[PDB]
Design a protein around this ligand. Structure first.
Ligand SMILES: CC(=O)N(CC#Cc1cccc(C(N)=O)c1)C[C@H]1C[C@@H](n2ccc3c(Cl)ncnc32)[C@H](O)[C@@H]1O
Length: 271
Protein backbone atom coordinates (compact mmCIF):
# COMPACT_ATOMS: atom_id res chain seq x y z
CA UNK A 1 0.00 0.00 0.00
CA UNK A 2 1.71 3.15 -1.31
CA UNK A 3 -0.62 5.73 -2.86
CA UNK A 4 0.94 7.94 -5.53
CA UNK A 5 -1.91 10.36 -6.42
CA UNK A 6 -1.81 9.44 -10.10
CA UNK A 7 1.95 9.78 -10.65
CA UNK A 8 1.96 6.05 -11.45
CA UNK A 9 -0.82 3.49 -11.87
CA UNK A 10 -2.34 2.19 -8.66
CA UNK A 11 -0.50 -0.73 -7.09
CA UNK A 12 2.57 -0.18 -9.27
CA UNK A 13 4.94 2.01 -7.24
CA UNK A 14 7.36 -0.78 -6.31
CA UNK A 15 7.07 -3.19 -9.24
CA UNK A 16 6.22 -0.82 -12.09
CA UNK A 17 2.90 -2.50 -12.92
CA UNK A 18 -0.46 -2.71 -11.11
CA UNK A 19 -0.50 -5.73 -8.84
CA UNK A 20 -3.43 -8.07 -9.40
CA UNK A 21 -4.50 -7.54 -5.77
CA UNK A 22 -5.31 -3.94 -6.69
CA UNK A 23 -8.23 -5.29 -8.75
CA UNK A 24 -9.75 -6.64 -5.51
CA UNK A 25 -9.54 -3.27 -3.72
CA UNK A 26 -9.56 -0.30 -6.09
CA UNK A 27 -11.32 -1.58 -9.22
CA UNK A 28 -14.97 -0.54 -8.97
CA UNK A 29 -17.02 -2.40 -11.61
CA UNK A 30 -19.92 0.08 -11.41
CA UNK A 31 -17.65 3.06 -12.14
CA UNK A 32 -16.02 1.12 -14.98
CA UNK A 33 -19.39 0.23 -16.52
CA UNK A 34 -20.75 3.77 -16.20
CA UNK A 35 -17.60 5.26 -17.72
CA UNK A 36 -17.06 2.94 -20.70
CA UNK A 37 -20.33 1.14 -21.53
CA UNK A 38 -23.24 3.58 -21.10
CA UNK A 39 -23.52 3.64 -24.92
CA UNK A 40 -23.71 9.49 -28.41
CA UNK A 41 -20.85 8.89 -30.86
CA UNK A 42 -18.29 9.11 -28.05
CA UNK A 43 -14.87 7.56 -28.60
CA UNK A 44 -15.87 4.83 -26.13
CA UNK A 45 -19.00 3.94 -28.12
CA UNK A 46 -17.12 3.75 -31.44
CA UNK A 47 -14.57 1.36 -29.94
CA UNK A 48 -17.39 -0.70 -28.44
CA UNK A 49 -19.27 -0.85 -31.75
CA UNK A 50 -16.15 -2.08 -33.52
CA UNK A 51 -15.63 -4.80 -30.90
CA UNK A 52 -19.26 -5.86 -31.38
CA UNK A 53 -18.97 -5.86 -35.18
CA UNK A 54 -15.84 -8.02 -35.07
CA UNK A 55 -17.38 -10.40 -32.54
CA UNK A 56 -20.43 -10.60 -34.80
CA UNK A 57 -18.19 -11.36 -37.79
CA UNK A 58 -16.14 -13.96 -35.88
CA UNK A 59 -18.96 -15.97 -34.33
CA UNK A 60 -21.83 -15.46 -36.81
CA UNK A 61 -20.21 -14.98 -40.24
CA UNK A 62 -17.01 -17.00 -39.80
CA UNK A 63 -17.02 -20.61 -38.59
CA UNK A 64 -16.01 -20.17 -34.93
CA UNK A 65 -18.50 -22.41 -33.12
CA UNK A 66 -18.66 -25.41 -30.83
CA UNK A 67 -19.88 -26.74 -27.51
CA UNK A 68 -17.89 -24.65 -25.01
CA UNK A 69 -16.48 -21.12 -25.04
CA UNK A 70 -14.46 -19.84 -22.07
CA UNK A 71 -14.37 -16.07 -21.66
CA UNK A 72 -11.10 -15.23 -19.88
CA UNK A 73 -11.09 -11.97 -17.94
CA UNK A 74 -14.72 -11.06 -18.55
CA UNK A 75 -14.58 -8.07 -16.24
CA UNK A 76 -18.12 -7.03 -15.31
CA UNK A 77 -19.22 -6.92 -18.96
CA UNK A 78 -21.28 -9.15 -21.23
CA UNK A 79 -21.05 -7.22 -24.52
CA UNK A 80 -18.38 -9.67 -25.68
CA UNK A 81 -20.78 -12.63 -25.42
CA UNK A 82 -23.92 -11.45 -27.23
CA UNK A 83 -22.97 -12.80 -30.65
CA UNK A 84 -21.09 -15.73 -29.10
CA UNK A 85 -24.23 -17.24 -27.55
CA UNK A 86 -25.56 -17.81 -31.09
CA UNK A 87 -22.73 -20.24 -31.95
CA UNK A 88 -21.81 -21.87 -28.61
CA UNK A 89 -24.03 -24.09 -26.49
CA UNK A 90 -22.24 -23.29 -23.21
CA UNK A 91 -20.32 -20.19 -22.08
CA UNK A 92 -18.12 -19.88 -18.98
CA UNK A 93 -17.30 -16.37 -17.76
CA UNK A 94 -14.24 -15.75 -15.58
CA UNK A 95 -12.38 -12.89 -13.92
CA UNK A 96 -9.83 -12.27 -11.20
CA UNK A 97 -11.87 -9.56 -9.47
CA UNK A 98 -14.55 -10.81 -7.07
CA UNK A 99 -16.43 -7.52 -7.48
CA UNK A 100 -16.59 -8.15 -11.23
CA UNK A 101 -17.98 -11.65 -10.74
CA UNK A 102 -20.63 -10.31 -8.35
CA UNK A 103 -21.70 -7.71 -10.92
CA UNK A 104 -21.93 -10.51 -13.51
CA UNK A 105 -24.02 -12.67 -11.17
CA UNK A 106 -26.38 -9.76 -10.50
CA UNK A 107 -26.95 -9.46 -14.25
CA UNK A 108 -27.34 -13.23 -14.66
CA UNK A 109 -30.15 -13.23 -12.08
CA UNK A 110 -31.68 -10.12 -13.71
CA UNK A 111 -31.40 -8.30 -10.39
CA UNK A 112 -32.88 -4.77 -10.52
CA UNK A 113 -29.61 -3.17 -9.39
CA UNK A 114 -27.64 -4.78 -12.24
CA UNK A 115 -26.20 -2.67 -15.05
CA UNK A 116 -28.55 -2.11 -17.99
CA UNK A 117 -27.13 -3.69 -21.15
CA UNK A 118 -30.29 -3.05 -23.22
CA UNK A 119 -28.94 -0.51 -25.78
CA UNK A 120 -25.89 -2.71 -26.38
CA UNK A 121 -28.14 -5.75 -26.75
CA UNK A 122 -30.34 -3.88 -29.24
CA UNK A 123 -27.32 -2.90 -31.33
CA UNK A 124 -26.17 -6.52 -31.57
CA UNK A 125 -29.71 -7.58 -32.47
CA UNK A 126 -29.52 -4.98 -35.24
CA UNK A 127 -26.24 -6.47 -36.49
CA UNK A 128 -27.72 -9.98 -36.52
CA UNK A 129 -30.66 -8.98 -38.74
CA UNK A 130 -33.32 -8.29 -36.07
CA UNK A 131 -34.28 -11.97 -35.92
CA UNK A 132 -35.07 -11.31 -32.23
CA UNK A 133 -35.49 -8.28 -30.00
CA UNK A 134 -33.41 -7.33 -26.98
CA UNK A 135 -35.12 -9.28 -24.18
CA UNK A 136 -35.17 -12.58 -26.09
CA UNK A 137 -31.49 -12.10 -26.98
CA UNK A 138 -30.64 -11.26 -23.36
CA UNK A 139 -32.38 -14.40 -22.08
CA UNK A 140 -30.63 -16.58 -24.65
CA UNK A 141 -27.27 -15.26 -23.45
CA UNK A 142 -28.24 -15.66 -19.80
CA UNK A 143 -29.17 -19.30 -20.38
CA UNK A 144 -25.86 -19.86 -22.22
CA UNK A 145 -23.70 -18.73 -19.27
CA UNK A 146 -23.27 -21.90 -17.20
CA UNK A 147 -20.51 -20.94 -14.74
CA UNK A 148 -18.99 -17.81 -13.21
CA UNK A 149 -15.44 -18.59 -12.09
CA UNK A 150 -12.28 -17.09 -10.64
CA UNK A 151 -9.41 -16.86 -13.12
CA UNK A 152 -5.75 -15.93 -12.74
CA UNK A 153 -3.87 -15.90 -16.04
CA UNK A 154 -0.52 -15.94 -14.20
CA UNK A 155 -1.19 -19.50 -12.95
CA UNK A 156 -0.35 -22.70 -14.82
CA UNK A 157 -3.99 -23.69 -14.24
CA UNK A 158 -5.81 -20.38 -14.85
CA UNK A 159 -9.12 -21.72 -13.53
CA UNK A 160 -7.53 -23.56 -10.62
CA UNK A 161 -9.09 -26.87 -9.62
CA UNK A 162 -12.41 -26.27 -11.46
CA UNK A 163 -12.77 -29.06 -14.06
CA UNK A 164 -14.01 -28.21 -17.54
CA UNK A 165 -14.19 -30.10 -20.82
CA UNK A 166 -11.65 -28.92 -23.40
CA UNK A 167 -13.13 -25.78 -24.89
CA UNK A 168 -13.77 -25.02 -28.54
CA UNK A 169 -12.85 -21.36 -28.06
CA UNK A 170 -11.09 -19.12 -25.56
CA UNK A 171 -12.17 -15.48 -25.78
CA UNK A 172 -10.43 -12.56 -24.04
CA UNK A 173 -11.31 -8.90 -24.62
CA UNK A 174 -9.47 -6.01 -22.90
CA UNK A 175 -8.03 -8.44 -20.32
CA UNK A 176 -4.48 -9.51 -21.18
CA UNK A 177 -3.06 -5.98 -21.52
CA UNK A 178 -4.20 -5.32 -17.95
CA UNK A 179 -3.30 -8.69 -16.42
CA UNK A 180 0.19 -9.26 -17.84
CA UNK A 181 2.98 -6.99 -16.51
CA UNK A 182 5.54 -8.06 -19.13
CA UNK A 183 5.77 -9.91 -22.43
CA UNK A 184 7.10 -13.17 -20.87
CA UNK A 185 4.05 -13.24 -18.58
CA UNK A 186 1.86 -12.40 -21.59
CA UNK A 187 3.26 -15.32 -23.60
CA UNK A 188 3.00 -17.68 -20.61
CA UNK A 189 -0.60 -16.58 -20.01
CA UNK A 190 -1.46 -17.43 -23.63
CA UNK A 191 0.23 -20.80 -23.14
CA UNK A 192 -1.73 -21.42 -19.93
CA UNK A 193 -4.99 -20.57 -21.70
CA UNK A 194 -4.04 -23.20 -24.29
CA UNK A 195 -4.39 -25.97 -21.70
CA UNK A 196 -8.14 -25.20 -21.69
CA UNK A 197 -8.46 -25.64 -25.46
CA UNK A 198 -9.04 -28.72 -27.58
CA UNK A 199 -6.40 -29.37 -30.26
CA UNK A 200 -7.03 -26.86 -33.02
CA UNK A 201 -9.20 -24.78 -30.71
CA UNK A 202 -9.84 -21.12 -31.41
CA UNK A 203 -8.17 -18.25 -29.56
CA UNK A 204 -9.88 -14.86 -29.92
CA UNK A 205 -8.13 -11.80 -28.48
CA UNK A 206 -9.10 -8.13 -28.68
CA UNK A 207 -7.17 -5.49 -26.75
CA UNK A 208 -5.51 -2.08 -26.81
CA UNK A 209 -2.36 -1.25 -28.77
CA UNK A 210 0.53 0.72 -27.24
CA UNK A 211 -1.41 1.55 -24.07
CA UNK A 212 0.53 2.09 -20.83
CA UNK A 213 -2.48 2.89 -18.63
CA UNK A 214 -6.23 3.31 -18.57
CA UNK A 215 -8.47 5.41 -16.36
CA UNK A 216 -11.67 4.69 -14.48
CA UNK A 217 -12.39 8.30 -13.69
CA UNK A 218 -9.34 9.31 -11.67
CA UNK A 219 -8.18 5.77 -10.78
CA UNK A 220 -5.27 4.75 -13.05
CA UNK A 221 -4.46 1.11 -13.85
CA UNK A 222 -1.43 -0.26 -15.66
CA UNK A 223 -1.54 -1.59 -19.21
CA UNK A 224 1.12 -3.49 -21.13
CA UNK A 225 1.99 -1.27 -24.16
CA UNK A 226 2.09 -3.86 -26.93
CA UNK A 227 2.59 -3.23 -30.61
CA UNK A 228 1.22 -5.49 -33.32
CA UNK A 229 4.60 -7.19 -33.82
CA UNK A 230 4.99 -8.11 -30.13
CA UNK A 231 1.42 -9.47 -29.96
CA UNK A 232 1.97 -11.70 -33.00
CA UNK A 233 5.29 -12.91 -31.57
CA UNK A 234 3.75 -13.79 -28.20
CA UNK A 235 0.81 -15.66 -29.74
CA UNK A 236 3.03 -17.74 -32.04
CA UNK A 237 5.54 -18.47 -29.27
CA UNK A 238 2.64 -19.60 -27.07
CA UNK A 239 1.83 -22.30 -29.64
CA UNK A 240 -0.81 -20.78 -31.95
CA UNK A 241 -1.09 -19.95 -35.64
CA UNK A 242 -2.85 -16.70 -36.52
CA UNK A 243 -5.74 -16.98 -38.96
CA UNK A 244 -6.40 -13.27 -39.18
CA UNK A 245 -5.15 -10.16 -37.41
CA UNK A 246 -6.75 -6.71 -37.54
CA UNK A 247 -5.47 -3.32 -36.39
CA UNK A 248 -7.74 -0.29 -36.10
CA UNK A 249 -6.51 3.23 -35.40
CA UNK A 250 -9.48 4.33 -33.25
CA UNK A 251 -8.37 5.09 -29.69
CA UNK A 252 -10.06 5.87 -26.41
CA UNK A 253 -10.30 9.48 -25.32
CA UNK A 254 -7.01 10.71 -23.89
CA UNK A 255 -8.78 11.15 -20.54
CA UNK A 256 -9.50 7.41 -20.34
CA UNK A 257 -6.55 5.62 -21.98
CA UNK A 258 -3.35 6.40 -23.88
CA UNK A 259 -3.81 3.64 -26.44
CA UNK A 260 -2.92 3.97 -30.12
CA UNK A 261 -5.67 1.85 -31.61
CA UNK A 262 -6.92 -1.66 -30.95
CA UNK A 263 -6.14 -5.09 -32.34
CA UNK A 264 -8.25 -8.18 -32.93
CA UNK A 265 -6.98 -11.63 -33.80
CA UNK A 266 -8.24 -15.17 -34.28
CA UNK A 267 -5.73 -17.97 -33.79
CA UNK A 268 -5.86 -21.77 -33.60
CA UNK A 269 -3.85 -23.95 -31.24
CA UNK A 270 -1.04 -25.70 -33.10
CA UNK A 271 0.12 -29.31 -32.99
C1 LIG B 1 -11.73 -7.18 -19.20
C2 LIG B 1 -11.86 -5.79 -18.64
O1 LIG B 1 -12.84 -5.15 -18.92
N1 LIG B 1 -10.85 -5.22 -17.78
C3 LIG B 1 -11.03 -3.87 -17.32
C4 LIG B 1 -10.57 -2.94 -18.34
C5 LIG B 1 -10.15 -2.23 -19.19
C6 LIG B 1 -9.55 -1.38 -20.21
C7 LIG B 1 -10.37 -0.50 -20.97
C8 LIG B 1 -9.88 0.34 -21.95
C9 LIG B 1 -8.52 0.37 -22.27
C10 LIG B 1 -7.68 -0.50 -21.54
C11 LIG B 1 -6.22 -0.47 -21.87
N2 LIG B 1 -5.68 0.63 -22.40
O2 LIG B 1 -5.51 -1.47 -21.64
C12 LIG B 1 -8.21 -1.34 -20.54
C13 LIG B 1 -9.63 -5.98 -17.46
C14 LIG B 1 -9.75 -7.11 -16.43
C15 LIG B 1 -8.37 -7.73 -16.15
C16 LIG B 1 -8.67 -8.56 -14.92
N3 LIG B 1 -7.46 -9.14 -14.36
C17 LIG B 1 -6.47 -8.44 -13.61
C18 LIG B 1 -5.51 -9.36 -13.27
C19 LIG B 1 -5.88 -10.64 -13.80
C20 LIG B 1 -5.36 -11.93 -13.82
CL1 LIG B 1 -3.83 -12.31 -13.02
N4 LIG B 1 -5.95 -12.96 -14.41
C21 LIG B 1 -7.15 -12.68 -15.05
N5 LIG B 1 -7.76 -11.48 -15.11
C22 LIG B 1 -7.10 -10.46 -14.47
C23 LIG B 1 -9.42 -7.60 -13.97
O3 LIG B 1 -10.23 -8.32 -13.09
C24 LIG B 1 -10.37 -6.88 -15.01
O4 LIG B 1 -11.61 -7.50 -14.93
Amino acid sequence: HHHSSGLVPRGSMESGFTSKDTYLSHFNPRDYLEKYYKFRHSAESQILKHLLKNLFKIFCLDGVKGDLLIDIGSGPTIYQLLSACESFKEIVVTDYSDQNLQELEKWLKAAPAAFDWSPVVTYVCDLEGNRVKGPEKEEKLRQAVKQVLKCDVTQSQPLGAVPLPPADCVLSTLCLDAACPDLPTYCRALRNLGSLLKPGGFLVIMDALKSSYYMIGEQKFSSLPLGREAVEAAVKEAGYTIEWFEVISQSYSSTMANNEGLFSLVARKLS
